[PDB]
Amino acid sequence: KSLKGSRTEKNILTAFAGESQARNRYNYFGGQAKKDGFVQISDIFAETADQEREHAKRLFKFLEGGDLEIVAAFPAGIIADTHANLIASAAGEHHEYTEMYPSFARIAREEGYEEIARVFASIAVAEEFHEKRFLDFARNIKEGRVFLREQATKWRCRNCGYVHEGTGAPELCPACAHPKAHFELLGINW
Ligand SMILES: [Fe+3]
Ligand SMILES: [Fe+3]
Ligand SMILES: [Zn+2]
Numbered sequence: 398k399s400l401k402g403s404r405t406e407k408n409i410l411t412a413f414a415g416e417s418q419a420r421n422r423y424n425y426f427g428g429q430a431k432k433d434g435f436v437q438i439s440d441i442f443a444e445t446a447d448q449e450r451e452h453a454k455r456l457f458k459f460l461e462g463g464d465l466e467i468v469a470a471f472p473a474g475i476i477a478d479t480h481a482n483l484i485a486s487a488a489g490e491h492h493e494y495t496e497m498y499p500s501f502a503r504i505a506r507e508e509g510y511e512e513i514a515r516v517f518a519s520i521a522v523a524e525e526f527h528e529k530r531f532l533d534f535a536r537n538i539k540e541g542r543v544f545l546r547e548q549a550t551k552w553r554c555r556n557c558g559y560v561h562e563g564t565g566a567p568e569l570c571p572a573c574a575h576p577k578a579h580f581e582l583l584g585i586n587w
Pocket of ligand 1: 523
C-alpha cells in the first residue's frame with residue numbers, strides 16, 4: 398500500500414538524511430586517515446561511505462515524491478584524528494543498528510509495510526559489521542598493532558601487492574618504495 402501520511406514514510410526520509418550525512422563524514426574521515434598514514438583504514442572509510450550510498454539508494458527508492466519535513470538530530474562535526482574518527486563512526490553505527498533501524502522496522506511492521514521493515518532490519522545487519530570494523534581498527538591504533546604484531550606474519554602492500562614476512566610492515570616497500578602506511582595484514586577471503 399501507499400506510504401503517504403504514514404510514520405514509516407517519515408522514518409524512511411529520516412534514515413535517508415542520516416545515511417547521506419554518514420556518506421560524507423566517512424569520505425572526510427577517509428581523507429584524514431590517508432593524511433594520518435593509514436591507507437587500509439582510509440580505503441575502509443571510503444568503502445563504508447559507498448555502502449552508505451547504497452543503503453540510502455534503497456531507502457530513497459521507496460519514496461513516492463513530494464517534500465516532507467523531518468525533525469532529527471545529527472552530528473554537528475567534527476573531523477579529528479583517525480582514532481577519534483573511528484570511535485565516532487562506530488558510535489553512529491551503534492545507534493543505527495541498536496536503536497534507529499530496529500525501531501523503524503517495528504513501526505513499519507506495525508503499519509503493514511513488511512517489505513520495508515525487512516529492509517530496515519537487513520541494513521541494520523550491515524551497520525553492525527561496519528561498527529565492528531571501526532572498533533577493531535580503533536583498537537589496533539590504540540594498541541599500536543596497525544603495523545606491528547607479536548608474532549611474524551604476512552603483510553601486503555596495498556599499492557603494489559608486495560608481500561613482506563615479519564613481525565611488522567617495513568618502513569618502505571622494497572618493490573614500489575611507498576611508505577609503511579600502505580601495508581595491511583595479508584588477507585585471503587576466498
Ligand atoms: Fe554503516
Ligand atoms: Fe609496494
Ligand atoms: Zn547505512
